[PDB]
């Protein structure tokens, strides 16, 4: 007896358990050191003893009525799903398959490749690439990477790991492509609420016809383990992929989907995502300013609450040992021929956190 | 552009959108229509603002814990899934792929069929039969099923929609069965503290060493909507198993697998499971004695809150518009000639609710 090959697919981990032994300040984990706001809490637990019982696989109608006001969409566009996870996991296995190729851009999220695999379809690479002046996509890179079988592209913005942030004249080549090959858009955009500057424009904008948006409610309200998502697309699309869900995992939690339908609607009335983006800002700065003024290259991120920095002669491993901080290597998010000596940092950690790793990195440089 | 081919796998939602329209009572509905335990409510109010954030994909500790001392098992060999139907996703998606087959009891819970396909595996249907005496599984049939390509045999106790509970003696069978010809064993076991005779044995017991069982908080507790459920297994496949519901849906809602953990101790230090048992044996009674006082064939159930009747003449959709209750017919669970005028009720409504139904079936006979 043994388990089917697929389960093939089956350092993040591992990182944060040797932080854990060596009592390092662990940079390395991808979600929030501190609690949801107090909103949500109460909406949640206004919630729980009213709605405690299965909800429809494509959501709760609250819950997609609120997407759609944000959106401009009609709640038949929106699905929600068991945390973006699922989404990203549901749209790959209902847009690709054996003999169809998907464009994934490297440095990636981890989940892309093996949803791509679980499809049975071919993942090709296209590299962004490492500038003086940072991370650029390079439209010629990207157009020379389709052929007759691809069939969607990924695209993560506000970008995990880079905190890159794709700007209008990108996007509207993109959708030229798109439309010009026929091509399927997924766009991951759980950090939407995340950037620093200007308010950024989406993918769907421009191609409205072909592109899938997915969302989290954790990224968006600093409760990543709540698992609640989304996808917005067109609307001849959403019935196939609130089915797919239902074999998956049925339908989202009930009264977290109540709550965050109700956290929606006011984050948006009280400012909420505001308070957020500044409250980060500050935070990306101090670490920026502070791995800065030791003489390290850091590429100040537009968005997300992560980036990336180089560090000249080290490793991941030496690194957490004797300056007891713990980054996740470049790569963790390149297939091959990762950059040399380059780490990426997350900033979702309190000032004092952060401070205590500028003054270990500063000892050992 | 268009949507792969295996989102042709994306009447109960038909149904109960009908009932609605018409103002009958519902009896398709395979729900409580009540609140969960207070016990429950104030566990996961408890964990609220404390553990907000992504849980291990294998599951908190202290739920994985919880769950190997009921078990008697090491917390190694458990893995917390989004619901059990994200258990029975991933098995399926983990044991079997094209060129096997999956042996599949008829009458059959709505997941198996399709999650059998879209892991690319053939399901071989072996039908119950429906003798004088009620629903039985025959041994030679279920032998003659059995192929070289056959690698798993997925069986569901407490039965959906039969309540047959499966003894000893045909458990023993199965396990003979599966050894022989070194077959993997999925058991369903939602329904596990819903029987109403002696405590049942667990498949498991008999073939602990290719033995996955599933389970569902919500199905034990009265909270379907929370989404969380477990597979219990060999400890050398679940490492895997884990690693393959991390790219489905990441990890179960961290707050509710909080609330759950705590839940499960309470539970069976309260008696509240003995409490559930008599709650829902006296409701199976009403309906199955008002049915009888009719003049009808009912299959007392041994398990679950499900109970299959015979209605000569009718079907569910003149049923639901002259009488004025939704019931499923047998066909939702049948892939082919499904018995005649045969239906699925469900008892877990309030006794007024079920009083109201017996009257007003009672006027049309
Ligand atoms: C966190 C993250 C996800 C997953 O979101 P969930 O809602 O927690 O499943 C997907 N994509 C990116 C880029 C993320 O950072
Ligand atoms: C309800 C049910 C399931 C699904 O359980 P969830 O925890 O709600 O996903 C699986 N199998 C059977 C027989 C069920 O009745």
Avoid at 54 to 73: D, M, N, Q, S, T
Avoid at 212 to 236: D, H, N, Q
């Amino acid at each position: 007896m043994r388990l089917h090959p697929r389960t093939e697919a089956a350092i993040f981990p591992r990182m944060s358990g040797l932080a854990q032994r060596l009592g390092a300040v662990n940079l390395g984990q991808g979600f929030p050191s501190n609690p949801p706001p107090p909103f949500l809490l109460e909406a949640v637990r206004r919630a729980l003893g009213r709605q405690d019982q299965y909800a429809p696989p494509a959501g709760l109608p609250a819950l997609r009525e609120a997407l759609a006001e944000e959106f401009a969409v009609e709640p038949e566009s929106v699905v929600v799903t068991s945390g973006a996870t699922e989404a990203l996991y549901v749209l790959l296995q209902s847009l690709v398959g054996p003999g169809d190729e998907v464009v994934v851009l490297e440095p990636f999220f981890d989940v892309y490749l093996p949803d791509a695999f679980l499809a049975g379809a071919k993942a090709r690479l296209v590299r962004l690439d490492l500038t003086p002046e940072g991370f650029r996509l390079d439209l010629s890179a990207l157009e020379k990477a389709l052929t007759p079988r691809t069939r969607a592209l990924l695209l993560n913005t506000p970008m995990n790991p880079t905190g890159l942030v794709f700007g209008e004249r990108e996007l509207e080549a993109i959708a030229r492509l798109a439309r010009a090959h026929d091509l399927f858009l997924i766009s991951d955009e759980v950090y939407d609420e995340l950037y620093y500057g200007e308010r950024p424009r989406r993918l769907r904008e421009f191609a409205p016809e072909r592109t899938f948006t997915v969302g989290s409610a954790g990224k968006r309200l600093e409760a990543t383990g709540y698992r609640v998502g989304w996808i917005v697309g067109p609307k001849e699309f959403m019935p196939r992929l609130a089915g797919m869900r239902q074999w998956t995992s049925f339908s989202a939690p009930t009264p977290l989907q109540a709550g965050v339908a109700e956290a929606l609607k006011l984050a948006r009335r009280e400012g909420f995502y505001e308070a957020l983006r500044e409250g980060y800002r500050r935070r990306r700065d101090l670490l920026a300013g502070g791995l800065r003024a030791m003489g390290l290259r850091v590429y100040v991120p537009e968005g997300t609450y992560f980036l990336m920095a180089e560090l000249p002669g080290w490793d991941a491993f030496r690194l957490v040992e004797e300056a007891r901080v713990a980054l996740i290597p470049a790569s963790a998010f390149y297939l091959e021929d990762p950059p040399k000596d380059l780490f990426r940092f997350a900033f979702c950690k309190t000032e004092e956190e952060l401070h205590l790793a500028l003054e270990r990195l500063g000892r050992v440089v």
